[PDB]
PDB file of C-alpha atoms in Angstrom:
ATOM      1  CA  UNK A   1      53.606  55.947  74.989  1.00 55.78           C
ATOM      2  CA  UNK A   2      53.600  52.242  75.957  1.00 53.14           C
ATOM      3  CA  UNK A   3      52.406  51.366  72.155  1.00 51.85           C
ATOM      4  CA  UNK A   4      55.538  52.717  71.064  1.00 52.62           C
ATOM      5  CA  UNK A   5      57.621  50.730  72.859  1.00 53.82           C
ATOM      6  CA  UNK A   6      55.288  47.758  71.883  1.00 53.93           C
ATOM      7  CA  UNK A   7      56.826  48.818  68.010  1.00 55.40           C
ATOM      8  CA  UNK A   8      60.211  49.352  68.945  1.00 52.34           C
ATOM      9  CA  UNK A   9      60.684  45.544  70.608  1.00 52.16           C
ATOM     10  CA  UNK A  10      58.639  44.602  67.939  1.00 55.34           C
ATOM     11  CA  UNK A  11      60.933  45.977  64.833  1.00 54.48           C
ATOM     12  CA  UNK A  12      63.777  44.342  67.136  1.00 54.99           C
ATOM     13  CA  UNK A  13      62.297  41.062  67.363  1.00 56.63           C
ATOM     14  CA  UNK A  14      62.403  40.788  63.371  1.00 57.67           C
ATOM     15  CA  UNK A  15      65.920  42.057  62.856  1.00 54.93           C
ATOM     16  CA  UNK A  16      64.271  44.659  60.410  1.00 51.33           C
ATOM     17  CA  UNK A  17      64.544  48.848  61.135  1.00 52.79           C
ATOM     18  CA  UNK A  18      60.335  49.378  60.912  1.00 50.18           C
ATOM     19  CA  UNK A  19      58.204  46.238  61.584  1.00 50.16           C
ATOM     20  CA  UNK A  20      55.410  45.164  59.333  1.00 52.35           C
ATOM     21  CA  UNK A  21      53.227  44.809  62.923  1.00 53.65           C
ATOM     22  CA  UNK A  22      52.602  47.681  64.967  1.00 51.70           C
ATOM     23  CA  UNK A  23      50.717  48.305  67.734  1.00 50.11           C
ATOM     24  CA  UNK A  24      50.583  52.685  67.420  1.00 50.96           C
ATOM     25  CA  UNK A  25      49.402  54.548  64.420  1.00 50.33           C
ATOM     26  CA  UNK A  26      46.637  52.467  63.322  1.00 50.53           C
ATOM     27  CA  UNK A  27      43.265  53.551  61.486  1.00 52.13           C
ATOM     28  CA  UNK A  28      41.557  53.451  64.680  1.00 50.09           C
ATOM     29  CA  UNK A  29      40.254  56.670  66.568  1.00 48.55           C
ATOM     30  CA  UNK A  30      41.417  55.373  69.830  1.00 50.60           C
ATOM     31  CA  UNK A  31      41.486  58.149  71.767  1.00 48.70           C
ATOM     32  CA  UNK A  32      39.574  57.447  74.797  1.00 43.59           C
ATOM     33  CA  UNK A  33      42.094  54.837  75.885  1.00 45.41           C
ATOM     34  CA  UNK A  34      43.355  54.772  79.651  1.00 49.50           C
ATOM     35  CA  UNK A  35      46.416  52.943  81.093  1.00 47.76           C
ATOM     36  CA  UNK A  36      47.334  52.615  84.445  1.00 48.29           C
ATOM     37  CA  UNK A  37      49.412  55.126  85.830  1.00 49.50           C
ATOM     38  CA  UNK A  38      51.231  57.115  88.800  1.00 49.63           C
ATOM     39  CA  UNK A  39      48.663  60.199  88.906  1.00 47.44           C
ATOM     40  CA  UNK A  40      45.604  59.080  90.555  1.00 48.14           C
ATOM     41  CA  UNK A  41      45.694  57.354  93.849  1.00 49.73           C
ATOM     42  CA  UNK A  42      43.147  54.744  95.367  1.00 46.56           C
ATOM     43  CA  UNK A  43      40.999  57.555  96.348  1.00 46.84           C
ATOM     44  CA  UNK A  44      40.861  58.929  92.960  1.00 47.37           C
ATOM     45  CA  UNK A  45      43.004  62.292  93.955  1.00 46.82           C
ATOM     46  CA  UNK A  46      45.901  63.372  92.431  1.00 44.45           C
ATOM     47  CA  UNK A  47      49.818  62.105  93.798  1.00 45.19           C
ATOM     48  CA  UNK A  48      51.455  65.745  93.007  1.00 46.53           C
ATOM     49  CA  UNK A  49      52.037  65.026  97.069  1.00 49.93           C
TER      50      UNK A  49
ATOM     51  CA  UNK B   1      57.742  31.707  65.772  1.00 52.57           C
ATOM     52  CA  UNK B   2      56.669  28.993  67.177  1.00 52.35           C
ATOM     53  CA  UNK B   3      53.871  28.445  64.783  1.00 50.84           C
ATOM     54  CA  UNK B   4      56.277  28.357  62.111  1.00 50.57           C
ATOM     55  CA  UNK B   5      58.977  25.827  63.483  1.00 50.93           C
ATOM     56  CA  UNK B   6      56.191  22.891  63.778  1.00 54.06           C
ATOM     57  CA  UNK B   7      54.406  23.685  60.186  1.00 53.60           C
ATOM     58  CA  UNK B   8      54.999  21.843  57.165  1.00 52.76           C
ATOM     59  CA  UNK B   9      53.585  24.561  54.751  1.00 49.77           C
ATOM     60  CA  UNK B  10      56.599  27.196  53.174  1.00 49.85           C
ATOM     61  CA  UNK B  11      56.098  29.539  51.316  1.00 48.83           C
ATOM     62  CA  UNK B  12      58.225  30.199  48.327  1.00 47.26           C
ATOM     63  CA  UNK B  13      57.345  33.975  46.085  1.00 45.68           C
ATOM     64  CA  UNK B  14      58.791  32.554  43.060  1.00 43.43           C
ATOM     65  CA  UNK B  15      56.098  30.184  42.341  1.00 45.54           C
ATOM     66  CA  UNK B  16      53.735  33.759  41.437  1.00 44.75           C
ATOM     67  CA  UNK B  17      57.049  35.177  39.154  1.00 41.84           C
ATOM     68  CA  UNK B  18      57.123  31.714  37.426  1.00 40.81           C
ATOM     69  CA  UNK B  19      53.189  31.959  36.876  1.00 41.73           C
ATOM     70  CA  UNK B  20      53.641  35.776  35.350  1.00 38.87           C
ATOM     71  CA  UNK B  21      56.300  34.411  33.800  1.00 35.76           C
ATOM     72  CA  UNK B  22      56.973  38.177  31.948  1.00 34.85           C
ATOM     73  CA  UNK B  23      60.016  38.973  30.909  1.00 36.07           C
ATOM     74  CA  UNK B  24      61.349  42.837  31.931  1.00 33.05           C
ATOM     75  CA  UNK B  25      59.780  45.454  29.685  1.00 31.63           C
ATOM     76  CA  UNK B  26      61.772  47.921  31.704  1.00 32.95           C
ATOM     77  CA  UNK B  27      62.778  49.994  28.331  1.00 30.20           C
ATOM     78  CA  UNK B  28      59.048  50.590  27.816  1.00 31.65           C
ATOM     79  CA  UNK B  29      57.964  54.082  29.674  1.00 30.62           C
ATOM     80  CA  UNK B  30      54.276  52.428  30.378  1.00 29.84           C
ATOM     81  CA  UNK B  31      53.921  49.350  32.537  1.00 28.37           C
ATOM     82  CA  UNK B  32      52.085  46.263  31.431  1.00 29.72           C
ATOM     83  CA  UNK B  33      49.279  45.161  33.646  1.00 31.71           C
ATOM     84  CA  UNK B  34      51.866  41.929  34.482  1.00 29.65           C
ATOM     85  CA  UNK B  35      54.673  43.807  35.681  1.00 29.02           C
ATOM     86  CA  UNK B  36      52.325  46.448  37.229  1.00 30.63           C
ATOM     87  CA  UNK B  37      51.176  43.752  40.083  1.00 30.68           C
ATOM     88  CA  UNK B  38      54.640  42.003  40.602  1.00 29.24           C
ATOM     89  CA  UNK B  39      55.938  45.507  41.867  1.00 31.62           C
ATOM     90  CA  UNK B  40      53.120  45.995  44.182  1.00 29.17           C
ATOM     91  CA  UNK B  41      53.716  42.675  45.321  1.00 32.41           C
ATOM     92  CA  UNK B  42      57.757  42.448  45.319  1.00 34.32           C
ATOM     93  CA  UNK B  43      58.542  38.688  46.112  1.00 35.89           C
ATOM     94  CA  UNK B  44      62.024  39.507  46.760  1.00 37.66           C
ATOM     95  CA  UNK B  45      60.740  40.664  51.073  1.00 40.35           C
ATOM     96  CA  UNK B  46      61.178  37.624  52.811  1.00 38.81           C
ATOM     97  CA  UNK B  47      59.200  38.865  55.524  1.00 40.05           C
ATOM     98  CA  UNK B  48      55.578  36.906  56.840  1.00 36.84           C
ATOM     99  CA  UNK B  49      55.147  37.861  60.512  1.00 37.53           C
TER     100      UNK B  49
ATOM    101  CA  UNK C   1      60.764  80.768  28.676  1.00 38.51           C
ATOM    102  CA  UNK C   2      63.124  81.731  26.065  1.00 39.85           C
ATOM    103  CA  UNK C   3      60.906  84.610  23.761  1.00 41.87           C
ATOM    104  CA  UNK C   4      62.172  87.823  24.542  1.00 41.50           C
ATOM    105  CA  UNK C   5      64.879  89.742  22.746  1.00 40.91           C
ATOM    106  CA  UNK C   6      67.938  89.233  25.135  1.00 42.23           C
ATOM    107  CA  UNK C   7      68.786  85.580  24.197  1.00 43.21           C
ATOM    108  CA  UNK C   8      72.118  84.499  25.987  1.00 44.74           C
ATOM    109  CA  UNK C   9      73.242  80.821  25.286  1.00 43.77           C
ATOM    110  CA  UNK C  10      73.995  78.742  28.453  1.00 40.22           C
ATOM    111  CA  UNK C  11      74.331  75.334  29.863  1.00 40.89           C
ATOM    112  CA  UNK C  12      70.823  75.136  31.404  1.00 40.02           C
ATOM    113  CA  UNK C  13      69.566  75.747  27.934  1.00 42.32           C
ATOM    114  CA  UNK C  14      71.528  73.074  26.582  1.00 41.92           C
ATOM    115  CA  UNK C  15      70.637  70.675  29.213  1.00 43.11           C
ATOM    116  CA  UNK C  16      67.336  71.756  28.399  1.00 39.70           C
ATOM    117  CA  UNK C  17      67.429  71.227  24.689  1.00 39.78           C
ATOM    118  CA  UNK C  18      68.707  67.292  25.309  1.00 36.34           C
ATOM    119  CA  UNK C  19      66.107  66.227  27.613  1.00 35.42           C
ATOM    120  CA  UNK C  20      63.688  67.377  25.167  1.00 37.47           C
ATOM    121  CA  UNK C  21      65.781  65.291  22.945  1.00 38.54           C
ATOM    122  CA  UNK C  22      65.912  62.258  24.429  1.00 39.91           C
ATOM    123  CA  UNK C  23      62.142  61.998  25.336  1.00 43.56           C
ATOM    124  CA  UNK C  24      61.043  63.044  22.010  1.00 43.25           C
ATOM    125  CA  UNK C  25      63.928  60.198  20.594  1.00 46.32           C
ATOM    126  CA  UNK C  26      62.161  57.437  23.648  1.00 44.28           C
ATOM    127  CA  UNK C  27      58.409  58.153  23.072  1.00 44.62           C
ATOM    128  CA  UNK C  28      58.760  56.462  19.797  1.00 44.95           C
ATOM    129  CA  UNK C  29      57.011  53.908  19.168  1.00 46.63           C
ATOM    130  CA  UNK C  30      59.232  51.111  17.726  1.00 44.01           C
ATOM    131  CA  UNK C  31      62.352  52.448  20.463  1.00 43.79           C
ATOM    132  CA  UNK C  32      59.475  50.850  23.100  1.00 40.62           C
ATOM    133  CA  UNK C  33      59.982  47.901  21.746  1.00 39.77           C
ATOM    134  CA  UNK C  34      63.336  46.834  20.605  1.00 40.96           C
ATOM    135  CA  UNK C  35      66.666  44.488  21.679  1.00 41.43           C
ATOM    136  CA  UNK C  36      69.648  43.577  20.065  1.00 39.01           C
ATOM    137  CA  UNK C  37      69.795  40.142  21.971  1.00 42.47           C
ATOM    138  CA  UNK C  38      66.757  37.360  21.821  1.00 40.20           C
ATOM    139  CA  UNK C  39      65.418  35.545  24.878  1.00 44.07           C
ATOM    140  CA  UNK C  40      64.815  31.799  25.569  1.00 42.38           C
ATOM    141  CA  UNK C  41      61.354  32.129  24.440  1.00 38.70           C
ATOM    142  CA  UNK C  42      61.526  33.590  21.474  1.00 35.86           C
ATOM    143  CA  UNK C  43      64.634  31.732  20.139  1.00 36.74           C
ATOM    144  CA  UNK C  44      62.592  29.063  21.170  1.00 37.61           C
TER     145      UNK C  44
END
């Protein structure tokens, strides 16, 4: 998700409706990727509590 | 941006059209390798980020 | 396309029948070719 946004300012920056740069959709198999988040805790258990 | 506010290089796209220098065969169904490689190319984008 | 006995004239037929035209008249080879003005080069 946050590469999209990453795009989206991006296309803004340049005045221009799709930007030549992007940060999402590349040739790269980048699936094993991992971004901060609200899920895990400092124990490594889940926050659904 | 910044980059490009302190650099005395510009680029201009006409100089490769003046090189070509090929008038429009548009009338011909085939294109000729010369026009073939301006199209992929299309100097009239203004955009270098 | 158009062989069997029941032949009925229509206006898909006639469109048709000019694009046919107008390639055939386009693919020639001296039409490729051709202007009625002259550019800067070869007036020069």
């Amino acid at each position: 998700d946050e590469a999209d946004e990453a795009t989206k300012k991006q296309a803004k920056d340049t005045d221009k409706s799709k930007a030549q740069v992007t940060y999402s959709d590349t040739g790269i198999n980048n699936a094993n990727e991992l971004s901060r988040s609200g899920n895990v805790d400092n124990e490594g258990g889940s926050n659904q509590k | 941006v910044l980059l490009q506010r302190i650099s005395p290089l510009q680029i201009d796209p006409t100089i490769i059209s003046n090189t070509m220098s090929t008038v429009s065969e548009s009338t011909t169904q085939t294109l000729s390798p010369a026009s073939s490689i301006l199209g992929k190319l299309r100097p009239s984008n203004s955009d270098f980020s | 396309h158009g062989l069997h006995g029941n032949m009925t004239l229509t206006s898909s037929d006639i469109q048709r029948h000019i694009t046919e035209f107008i390639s055939s008249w386009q693919n020639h080879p001296i039409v490729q070719v051709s202007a009625d003005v002259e550019n800067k080069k070869t007036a020069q």
